[PDB]
Structures are given as C-alpha cells and as structure tokens.
Design an enzyme around this catalytic site. Structure first.
Site, mmCIF file in Angstrom:
data_model
loop_
_atom_site.group_PDB
_atom_site.id
_atom_site.type_symbol
_atom_site.label_atom_id
_atom_site.label_comp_id
_atom_site.label_asym_id
_atom_site.label_seq_id
_atom_site.Cartn_x
_atom_site.Cartn_y
_atom_site.Cartn_z
ATOM 1 N N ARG A 28 -17.056 3.692 -5.091
ATOM 2 C CA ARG A 28 -16.190 4.845 -4.992
ATOM 3 C C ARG A 28 -16.885 6.151 -5.335
ATOM 4 O O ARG A 28 -16.487 7.227 -4.865
ATOM 5 C CB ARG A 28 -14.842 4.582 -5.677
ATOM 6 C CG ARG A 28 -13.795 5.708 -5.525
ATOM 7 C CD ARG A 28 -13.364 6.042 -4.108
ATOM 8 N NE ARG A 28 -12.997 4.892 -3.223
ATOM 9 C CZ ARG A 28 -11.724 4.429 -3.006
ATOM 10 N NH1 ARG A 28 -10.654 4.925 -3.667
ATOM 11 N NH2 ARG A 28 -11.541 3.446 -2.132
ATOM 12 N N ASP A 39 -8.073 -5.510 -1.834
ATOM 13 C CA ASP A 39 -8.212 -6.291 -3.028
ATOM 14 C C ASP A 39 -7.872 -7.742 -2.906
ATOM 15 O O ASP A 39 -8.318 -8.533 -3.735
ATOM 16 C CB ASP A 39 -7.523 -5.630 -4.221
ATOM 17 C CG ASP A 39 -8.076 -4.219 -4.438
ATOM 18 O OD1 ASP A 39 -9.365 -4.152 -4.597
ATOM 19 O OD2 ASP A 39 -7.388 -3.246 -4.287
ATOM 20 N N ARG A 78 -10.063 -3.094 5.894
ATOM 21 C CA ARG A 78 -11.017 -3.526 4.911
ATOM 22 C C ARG A 78 -10.814 -4.994 4.607
ATOM 23 O O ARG A 78 -11.771 -5.704 4.329
ATOM 24 C CB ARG A 78 -10.902 -2.692 3.603
ATOM 25 C CG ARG A 78 -11.374 -1.272 3.872
ATOM 26 C CD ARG A 78 -11.122 -0.346 2.718
ATOM 27 N NE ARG A 78 -9.723 -0.351 2.291
ATOM 28 C CZ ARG A 78 -9.245 0.224 1.164
ATOM 29 N NH1 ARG A 78 -10.010 0.890 0.294
ATOM 30 N NH2 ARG A 78 -7.953 0.111 0.905
ATOM 31 N N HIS A 102 0.838 -1.224 0.000
ATOM 32 C CA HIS A 102 0.000 0.000 0.000
ATOM 33 C C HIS A 102 0.857 1.252 0.000
ATOM 34 O O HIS A 102 1.952 1.253 0.588
ATOM 35 C CB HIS A 102 -0.960 0.050 1.229
ATOM 36 C CG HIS A 102 -2.197 0.886 0.963
ATOM 37 N ND1 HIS A 102 -2.223 2.229 1.295
ATOM 38 C CD2 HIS A 102 -3.389 0.595 0.366
ATOM 39 C CE1 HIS A 102 -3.420 2.682 0.921
ATOM 40 N NE2 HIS A 102 -4.161 1.741 0.349
ATOM 41 N N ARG A 139 -2.893 22.980 -9.320
ATOM 42 C CA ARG A 139 -1.860 23.215 -10.300
ATOM 43 C C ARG A 139 -0.528 23.454 -9.631
ATOM 44 O O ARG A 139 -0.111 24.575 -9.354
ATOM 45 C CB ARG A 139 -2.338 24.384 -11.155
ATOM 46 C CG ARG A 139 -1.800 24.341 -12.606
ATOM 47 C CD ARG A 139 -0.277 24.487 -12.721
ATOM 48 N NE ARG A 139 0.173 24.682 -14.115
ATOM 49 C CZ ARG A 139 1.382 24.369 -14.583
ATOM 50 N NH1 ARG A 139 2.314 23.870 -13.786
ATOM 51 N NH2 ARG A 139 1.666 24.574 -15.857
HETATM 52 C C1 LIG Z 1 -0.052 -0.504 -3.810
HETATM 53 C C2 LIG Z 1 1.373 -0.217 -4.339
HETATM 54 C C3 LIG Z 1 1.410 0.372 -5.760
HETATM 55 C C4 LIG Z 1 2.060 0.781 -3.428
HETATM 56 O O1 LIG Z 1 3.175 1.321 -4.123
HETATM 57 P P1 LIG Z 1 4.430 2.067 -3.399
HETATM 58 O O2 LIG Z 1 3.864 2.918 -2.310
HETATM 59 O O3 LIG Z 1 5.176 2.596 -4.567
HETATM 60 O O4 LIG Z 1 5.050 0.723 -2.760
HETATM 61 P P2 LIG Z 1 6.425 0.633 -1.961
HETATM 62 O O5 LIG Z 1 7.006 1.929 -1.441
HETATM 63 O O6 LIG Z 1 6.307 -0.518 -1.055
HETATM 64 O O7 LIG Z 1 7.307 0.116 -3.191
HETATM 65 C C5 LIG Z 1 8.675 -0.199 -2.922
HETATM 66 C C6 LIG Z 1 9.115 -1.318 -3.830
HETATM 67 O O8 LIG Z 1 8.429 -2.549 -3.457
HETATM 68 C C7 LIG Z 1 7.783 -3.098 -4.559
HETATM 69 N N1 LIG Z 1 6.531 -3.740 -4.158
HETATM 70 C C8 LIG Z 1 5.564 -3.113 -3.420
HETATM 71 N N2 LIG Z 1 4.447 -3.830 -3.326
HETATM 72 C C9 LIG Z 1 4.682 -4.979 -4.074
HETATM 73 C C10 LIG Z 1 3.930 -6.147 -4.360
HETATM 74 N N3 LIG Z 1 2.708 -6.393 -3.966
HETATM 75 N N4 LIG Z 1 4.481 -7.086 -5.157
HETATM 76 C C11 LIG Z 1 5.707 -6.865 -5.603
HETATM 77 N N5 LIG Z 1 6.511 -5.825 -5.412
HETATM 78 C C12 LIG Z 1 5.950 -4.908 -4.619
HETATM 79 C C13 LIG Z 1 7.420 -1.840 -5.338
HETATM 80 O O9 LIG Z 1 6.867 -2.099 -6.602
HETATM 81 C C14 LIG Z 1 8.772 -1.112 -5.292
HETATM 82 O O10 LIG Z 1 9.778 -1.738 -6.052
HETATM 83 P P3 LIG Z 1 10.678 -0.842 -7.072
HETATM 84 O O11 LIG Z 1 11.555 -0.054 -6.149
HETATM 85 O O12 LIG Z 1 11.535 -1.723 -7.912
HETATM 86 O O13 LIG Z 1 9.748 0.100 -7.759
HETATM 87 C C15 LIG Z 1 2.246 -1.493 -4.301
HETATM 88 O O14 LIG Z 1 2.265 -2.009 -2.971
HETATM 89 C C16 LIG Z 1 1.799 -2.540 -5.308
HETATM 90 O O15 LIG Z 1 2.259 -2.480 -6.467
HETATM 91 N N6 LIG Z 1 0.932 -3.459 -4.915
HETATM 92 C C17 LIG Z 1 0.443 -4.480 -5.865
HETATM 93 C C18 LIG Z 1 -0.813 -3.959 -6.590
HETATM 94 C C19 LIG Z 1 -2.037 -3.783 -5.695
HETATM 95 O O16 LIG Z 1 -2.349 -4.668 -4.891
HETATM 96 N N7 LIG Z 1 -2.755 -2.648 -5.850
HETATM 97 C C20 LIG Z 1 -3.962 -2.387 -5.086
HETATM 98 C C21 LIG Z 1 -3.804 -1.301 -4.008
HETATM 99 C C22 LIG Z 1 -5.187 -1.064 -3.325
HETATM 100 C C23 LIG Z 1 -6.121 -0.243 -4.214
HETATM 101 N N8 LIG Z 1 -7.271 -0.783 -4.592
HETATM 102 O O17 LIG Z 1 -5.700 0.812 -4.684
HETATM 103 O O1 LIG Z 2 -5.458 4.405 -0.625
HETATM 104 C C1 LIG Z 2 -4.972 4.203 -1.758
HETATM 105 O O2 LIG Z 2 -3.939 4.754 -2.235
HETATM 106 C C2 LIG Z 2 -5.607 3.113 -2.572
HETATM 107 C C3 LIG Z 2 -6.707 2.337 -1.897
HETATM 108 O O3 LIG Z 2 -6.545 1.440 -1.094
HETATM 109 C C4 LIG Z 2 -8.054 2.851 -2.297
HETATM 110 O O4 LIG Z 2 -8.130 3.793 -3.067
HETATM 111 O O5 LIG Z 2 -9.036 2.237 -1.845
HETATM 112 O O1 LIG Z 3 -0.141 25.711 -17.698
HETATM 113 C C1 LIG Z 3 -1.297 25.521 -17.263
HETATM 114 O O2 LIG Z 3 -1.623 25.384 -16.049
HETATM 115 C C2 LIG Z 3 -2.410 25.589 -18.269
HETATM 116 C C3 LIG Z 3 -2.010 25.954 -19.674
HETATM 117 O O3 LIG Z 3 -1.782 27.079 -20.070
HETATM 118 C C4 LIG Z 3 -1.869 24.735 -20.529
HETATM 119 O O4 LIG Z 3 -2.062 23.635 -20.040
HETATM 120 O O5 LIG Z 3 -1.604 24.929 -21.729
#
Ligand SMILES: CC(C)(COP(=O)(O)OP(=O)(O)OC[C@H]1O[C@@H](n2cnc3c(N)ncnc32)[C@H](O)[C@@H]1OP(=O)(O)O)[C@@H](O)C(=O)NCCC(=O)NCCCC(N)=O
Ligand SMILES: O=C([O-])CC(=O)C(=O)O
Ligand SMILES: O=C([O-])CC(=O)C(=O)O
Ligand SMILES: CC(C)(COP(=O)(O)OP(=O)(O)OC[C@H]1O[C@@H](n2cnc3c(N)ncnc32)[C@H](O)[C@@H]1OP(=O)(O)O)[C@@H](O)C(=O)NCCC(=O)NCCCC(N)=O
Lengths: 435, 435
Positions: free
Chosen positions: A399, A373, A327, A318, A419
């Site tokens: 959502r 998830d 959740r 996360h 912005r």
């Molecule tokens: C959710 C998230 C994108 C968070 O990203 P983040 O905050 O960038 O994660 P982080 O700081 O732990 O990442 C550090 C490293 O661990 C890796 N890592 C993190 N979670 C991982 C997972 N589940 N599997 C594999 N590698 C993972 C990252 O991809 C990253 O590697 P990198 O340096 O080579 O890029 C990531 O944990 C992930 O990719 N999870 C798998 C997808 C997932 O379950 N998404 C659903 C999230 C809930 C929602 N519905 O939004």
């Molecule tokens: O909190 C987040 O970044 C993603 C997540 O779990 C959601 O949107 O439900």
């Molecule tokens: O720069 C901005 O915030 C908006 C703008 O002029 C563009 O997207 O072309």
C-alpha cells in the site's frame, strides 16, 4: 539517464495549469448532493476527494492510471524469466501515468536498493519489542520512529517555500519505500526466526526478491507470488481507509513517515486490511470445528452461526464494489495455475459457491461477493508463511506504493488542508425540523 | 454510587431510537451540494460527518454539548480554591451531555488515578529513544505500542457481538486517558530532566495536578493554567484533522490506542497542532532578528518577509472560524490576570494589532484572525516550560478527551466504515465535459 525526479519536474507544471483552467470554468459546478443518510453512513456514496493514481469502478473494479489489472499483467515489465509484474513498474505508472520501460524499471530497483538502510534507534526498538505486540503495531511504531530522518520535516523546519514541498516529499517517499521491506523483514525474523539476521540488500535484485530473501524464502514461485501480491495491493483509489488517512494526515503537512504510519493504524482495522488475517483465523476455526472436508450444508450452518452471533464474515462485501473483486479473481487464477489441489484453496473455492448466497439470503450486505482478502492468505499459507498475524504487514508494504505516489502529487498540486464541516444530531435535526 | 458506564447504559438506547426515527423521516433529505471546488479544496464547506460532542460556529466559536467556553468556566466544577475548570468535568459533559456534580467529577479523578499504569515494554522503549526523535513522534509510537493492552482489541478477537463494542471502547478510553499523562511526563523528563523520575500517582489529586507534579512544576498558578489548557484544547468538532483521523481510523474497528496514535500523527502537522510550537519558534527568530521591543513598522516588515518567502504566519487563520477564536480570547484574559507585564505576552498582544491587517492586505487568508495556537505557548514559557518542541504533546493530551468521548458514541450508535468515493481529475473532467 533515467531520473523520475526530472520527469516529474516536467509533468507538474502542465497538470497545474490544466487543473487551474478546469477549475476556472467548473469550480462551481455541482457534482452531487449530500443527504442525511450519507452523513450518518460514513459518507457512503459521497464524491469527496481528488485522488489521481487509481480509480475504482463499482462494477469493473480497479484501474491504475486507466489500466485494469489484466492490462497491467500484460504491459508491465516482468523479471527475467518471470510472469508476474514487478511492483517497481507499477510505481512508475502510478506516479507518471506512463507505462515504463524495462530500463526505467531497473533504475527504480537500483534506487530502492541504494536507499534501504535503517538507523540504529529503529533497530533497537524493534529488537526490544515483546512478542505479544501485534506485527502491525510494531510496523506503525517503527515507521513513526523513522521520522527523525525525514527530509521533508527538515526542509519545512528550514522554511522552504511551499512550491518546493513535492521535491522533499518525493525523496522521503523513495527512502520510505526502500526501507519498508527491511523493517518488515526484521519484524518477521524477530518474531518467528529468533536469532537469525535479515541479511543484506543485493543491489542487483528487484525489490520483491530482496524482500523474500530477507524473509528467508527460497522458492522461486514464492518470489513470483510476492511480485504479484505487492503489485495488486498497491492502491485502491482515495476513499479507502488507509489511503484517505494518509491523505488527510499529509494535508496538514505531516511528513510522509508520519502520514504512512497513521495509514497503517487504519489498515490494521478488522474492517480494513486486517481482514486478510481474519479470513485465515476464520478458516482455521472452520476446519477445526468441522474438520477439513466439509459438506455444503455444514458450511452454511457455520456461516449462519457467525452471522447470528453479531459478527462479520471476513473477506466478503465492499463499500464500493458491487461485483467480485478482480483482485480476488486474479488470485484465484494464480492458485489454479500453481496450487490447484491445495485443500485450503479448495475450501476457499467452495466458499465462493456458498457465502454469497448466504449473504444474499440474510439481506443486509449490499455486495455479497468476495474481496481481495478472501483469497490472499491461502496463497501465502501454501508456500510456508503460515504466520497469519503477519499478513497485514505485507498489505501495508504494498500500500505504500499507492499512497506515497499520490502524496507526491497532492503536494505538487497544492491541495490544502482536508477539513469538512461536522454536525451534531441535534444541530442537524434543527437544520431540517427534526424527526 | 457514581458510575459513568451505568449512565451511558441508559442514555444509549434512547439516542439510538431518536436517530432511527429521524432517519426514517429525513434520511433522504438533502443538506448540501458538492462542487468541483470543494473536492479540490480539502472538502472545505462540505457537511460531511456526524460528531456529537462539540459543534463549531464560524462566528461564535466552539460549543461543548451546547455550552460555550465562558459557560463552561462558569458551570464546571473547579478545584478546591481553584478558578479554572477541571478537565474531568469537561469529559463528563462531553460524554453525557450533562453538567456534572462535583461528586461526579471526583469519581472521574479517582478512576483516572486508579487506571494510570504503564507496561514495561513501553517504559523501555521511551527510555531507549534518541533525543533527536521529536516529542510527538515519541508520543505516537508509545500509544501505538500500548495497544498490546487493548481490551477492545481482545474482545473483538474473541468474537464479541457488535452491539457490545461501546463497552470495550469505553474501558480502553478511560485507560488511555489515565495513562496519557504518565507517557507524556516520561518523555518530558527523559528529554529535559535526564536522570530524574516522574514519580507516583496520588489518588487524591485531580488529573491536571498529578500531571504537573510528574512534569516537576510546583507553582500553583501553573496547576491552574494546566487545568484551563487541558479543558480548552479538548475538542473542536469532528472535521479538524486530529478528530477526523481518529474517527476515520476508529471506523474500521481499530482500537482506541491505534485510533488515537494516528490522530496524533495528524496533530503533529505544522498546519494543525504543531502550530503551537511553530508560533514560539517564529517569535524567537523575531525577537532575535529585531530584538525584544520592536516598532510596528519593523514587525510588519518581518511578517511580509515570511509571506513573501512562501511560508505561513503561524497561529493565524482557520478552516472554519471567521472571527477571533474564543480560545485565543480566553488565553489573553488569563495572561492579563496573571502575567500582564511579560514581554513575550506584550509581543503577542502587539501582533494582534498588526498581523490581521497584514493578512487582510495580502488578500489570501479567508480568516485573518488569530487561532488558539497564537496564545498558548506564551503562557507556558512564562512558567518556565520553555521547551517549545514539546508543546504539541500538551495539546495531544487534551485532545484525547474529546476524541475519545466521541469514539464511545460512534460505536454505541453503530456508525459504519467511513468510505467516500474519490475521483481523478481526468474522470471528473469527463463527468462534466472538461475545462
Ligand atoms: C467491507 C465492509 C466494511 C463494507 O461496509 P459497508 O459499505 O458499510 O457494507 P454494506 O453497505 O454492505 O453494509 C450493510 C450491512 O450489511 C452488513 N454486512 C456487510 N458485509 C458483511 C459481511 N461480510 N458479513 C456480515 N455482515 C456484513 C454490514 O455490516 C451492514 O449491517 P448493519 O446495517 O447492521 O451495519 C463490509 O462489507 C464488511 O464488514 N466486510 C467484512 C470485513 C472485510 O472483509 N473487510 C475487508 C474489505 C477489503 C479491504 N481490505 O479493505
Ligand atoms: O476500497 C476500499 O474501501 C478497501 C479496499 O478494498 C482496499 O483498500 O484495498
Ligand atoms: O478546528 C480545526 O480545524 C482545527 C482547530 O482549531 C483544532 O483542531 O483545535
Ligand atoms: C489553519 C489554515 C490551514 C486554514 O487553511 P484554509 O482553510 O485552507 O485557509 P484559507 O481558505 O484562508 O486559505 C486561503 C489562502 O490563504 C493562505 N493563508 C491562510 N492562512 C494563512 C496564514 N496564517 N499565513 C499565510 N497564508 C495563509 C492559505 O494558505 C491559502 O493560500 P493558497 O491559496 O496559496 O493556498 C490556515 O489558516 C493556515 O495555514 N494557518 C497557519 C497555520 C496554523 O496556524 N495552524 C493552526 C490552526 C489551529 C489548529 N491547532 O489546528
């Protein structure tokens, strides 16, 4: 008698003043600092937005207007004979900050039944879409096409004074929430129940129940799952991809329909909401490769292969949580009560004992725990909704409650265009010296 | 012989290392601070993103990979007998950082002609849309529907290693840019030239010229305007609504089609790209109320009424520029050369002498100067493209170049999910004390 719009009319000016004064006194107070790593890292750890409806604690998880999930379960009105909270009630809480009465809740349900109606051009479009077009793409396109009906778009074009924006956003918000289940159910039937009809809205039921009837499910426990599902997926603070996208697009004055459709394109991302679908596809390959009842050593091997192939393990990690997602817990608990012997459930449970360990061993993930998830689809599969490419649509439907509740407040509070300033690597090197 | 994909293959690993080291040395260096006012103010003034293709200076305006507009005009390859730069060349510069050769430019043109082809489900959808559905909404829905064709979506689903993401994003990027003019032209013809056809792509022309032919315009100066238009509207750093939206959605791993459609819903906002259309509607009411040749005193009155009614004066102000937009200047200059006696032009010119003054007098706008939107439609109207609700579509078509050029780099560089932390007013008060 009950009228959310009249309640907001009173609440607005008071919040307006409160924020005014606070800013008078602390507008220039520093709340944090920005480092190179944060800019390169997707703003990780930067406090960058005001979002009123919910706040996420990294340890404790989500709070909706101050209440945790267990609290909601306990305080929100339930259906007659029900145990799970009605999402209508959650919507009330997010928008007003107050726990609603059951009477308030039923008004929300009637309002939503009253406003549920689709224009024919949307109907045609959906009916003409190909079966290989992903359900989320069908959803986002339909909501975009619904903007011909926007009351906010119309009032803007008429030159309404900026002070009244919220009143029009509120109407489009309640119309959109009302329509969502019909659009979603239409997609479902066209793709998976070809030749059948979603039927009609029963002004006498809760939103969740009319949705499940349009989906064609009769099981009463399924109705209960849907109420819970729709409540828990509702909001997750403002920085999550989908809510931030709705917020950013809405800031430009695009209508709620356009703002929500854009959000949907963000939720369809594998790293965001599509993970719910990704978890079930990963589980299906699993049970396929390894066959149903796996040994722990075999599961670890399976996880390592994913990791070693440059892919993520879906449903784990996360950006902000640092502990197991409440959740996820909340879903586990539902499973233990209702489908404890389901084999897929059993598999999900087993992975809880292994995946984190593997992730910790790998040493890359900051949070090795599961997120919402990882437990959602398993419950849906149990009741017969085995179409995994459609799961994200359910998340989108939920959502809408959160993002739309905040959208009303953004306009009421007069938040301006979002912005920030960007930088190139070259410019940033110069700002510092380089490296 | 020429192959942008092979050039990027060399460039990538070198940038990767450069950024690696710099971050090693300065990752923890602080580049700024976050205040209460910034969080409440749409992150105004917060350095929050890395975006490589262009950088905007508040005084000087935009620079594309270090070059200003005049520089581009002067350095980029032009059409045979042309004066305006070809957008194909700008795309090359954004992606590689190098000024291309004319030979490189023609390859881009052929590639784009080769990849321009629409699937029938998109065609049907557009052809079935109602005439009251806004052109931008028709555009965003079509691009969303095109994702069935995504090569990135497909490779992701196949489990490709994260290191190769950029290669698939590049292909979808070049396919999308190729298709854009056909989608856009189809909308145009269906709405305004009912019963006619966009025709076919001529692999021998530049992208701008095939677009104008599909729009049905013969005037050669019009072809020149379109080249210029499409070049100047291409990119404007990363914090602008549309580019930030594409960036944020793309960060979740949504495909380029989904990411660009979401961006389009942000560009359709009145405070963003729709301002181009808003300027012409405001001008039309003007000339209508006051009738063609107005006195200065009457123009001021007209501006004051807008202001006093709680509305914005479109085409003026900016979130970051503090001086007149060089894009506005660049358009003025085109008008002076080609349509100096046009009455609408003359009106726009007169407003330049008045609006800023009025805005300064009012004292609210930080930047009282005009932005690109104040001068664009006037040029289009002159050549016969008087359908003002369609102007934003042109801006969208151009904006694809910039955002898509950066999208390739985001994935090549491995930027992660964009996910800042949000706060509630209540939580923020507590963080400080309150007020
Ligand atoms: C959710 C998230 C994108 C968070 O990203 P983040 O905050 O960038 O994660 P982080 O700081 O732990 O990442 C550090 C490293 O661990 C890796 N890592 C993190 N979670 C991982 C997972 N589940 N599997 C594999 N590698 C993972 C990252 O991809 C990253 O590697 P990198 O340096 O080579 O890029 C990531 O944990 C992930 O990719 N999870 C798998 C997808 C997932 O379950 N998404 C659903 C999230 C809930 C929602 N519905 O939004
Ligand atoms: O909190 C987040 O970044 C993603 C997540 O779990 C959601 O949107 O439900
Ligand atoms: O720069 C901005 O915030 C908006 C703008 O002029 C563009 O997207 O072309
Ligand atoms: C472009 C922009 C949204 C910038 O917003 P900002 O950075 O929040 O502007 P700012 O710091 O000057 O705003 C301060 C105050 O001046 C007001 N103001 C700014 N520009 C104004 C204008 N053109 N007309 C009227 N009032 C204006 C703001 O709305 C705000 O008032 P408020 O305190 O009551 O909210 C704003 O200048 C505006 O609304 N312009 C009119 C719309 C427009 O031309 N958009 C196109 C921009 C170019 C592009 N294509 O994206």
């Amino acid at each position: 008698s009950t009228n959310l719009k009249d309640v907001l009319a009173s609440l607005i000016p008071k919040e307006q003043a409160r924020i005014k004064t606070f800013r008078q006194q602390h507008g220039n107070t520093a709340v944090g600092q920005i480092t190179v790593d944060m800019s390169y890292g997707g703003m990780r750890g930067m406090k960058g937005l005001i979002y009123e409806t919910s706040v996420l604690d990294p340890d404790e998880g989500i709070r909706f207007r101050g209440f945790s999930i267990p609290e909601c379960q306990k305080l929100l009105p339930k259906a007659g004979g029900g145990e799970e909270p009605l999402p209508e009630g959650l919507f009330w809480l997010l928008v007003t900050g107050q726990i609603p009465t059951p009477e308030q809740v039923s008004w929300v349900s009637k309002e939503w039944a009253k406003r549920a109606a689709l224009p024919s051009h949307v109907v045609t479009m959906l009916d003409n879409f190909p079966t290989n077009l992903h359900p989320m793409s069908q959803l986002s396109a339909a909501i975009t096409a619904l903007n011909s009906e926007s009351n906010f778009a119309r009032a803007y074009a008429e030159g309404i004074n900026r002070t009244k924006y919220w009143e029009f956003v509120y109407e489009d918000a309640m119309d959109l929430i009302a329509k969502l289940p019909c659009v979603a159910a239409k997609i479902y039937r066209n793709l998976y129940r070809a030749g059948s009809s979603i039927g009609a809205i029963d002004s006498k039921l809760d939103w969740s129940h009319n949705f499940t009837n349009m989906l064609g499910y009769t099981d009463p426990q399924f109705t209960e799952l849907m109420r819970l599902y729709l409540t828990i997926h509702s909001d997750h603070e403002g920085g999550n991809v989908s809510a931030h996208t709705s917020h950013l697009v809405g800031s430009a004055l695009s209508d709620p329909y356009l703002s929500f459709a854009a959000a949907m394109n963000g939720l369809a991302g594998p790293l965001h909401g599509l993970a719910n679908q990704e978890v079930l596809l990963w589980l299906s390959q699993l049970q396929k490769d390894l066959g149903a009842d796996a040994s722990d050593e075999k599961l670890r091997d399976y996880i390592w292969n994913t990791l070693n192939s440059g892919r993520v393990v879906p449903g784990y990690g996360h950006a902000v949580l640092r502990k197991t997602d409440p959740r996820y817990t909340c879903q586990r608990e539902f499973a233990l009560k209702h489908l404890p012997s389901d084999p897929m459930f059993k598999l999900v449970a087993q992975l809880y004992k292994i995946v984190p360990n593997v992730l910790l061993e790998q040493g890359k993930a900051k949070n090795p725990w599961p997120n919402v998830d990882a437990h959602s689809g398993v419950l849906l599969q149990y009741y017969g909704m085995t179409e995994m490419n459609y799961y994200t649509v359910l998340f989108g439907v939920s959502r809408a409650l959160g993002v739309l509740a905040q959208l009303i407040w953004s306009r009421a509070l007069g938040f301006p265009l979002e912005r920030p300033k960007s930088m190139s690597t070259a410019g940033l090197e110069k700002l510092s010296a380089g490296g």
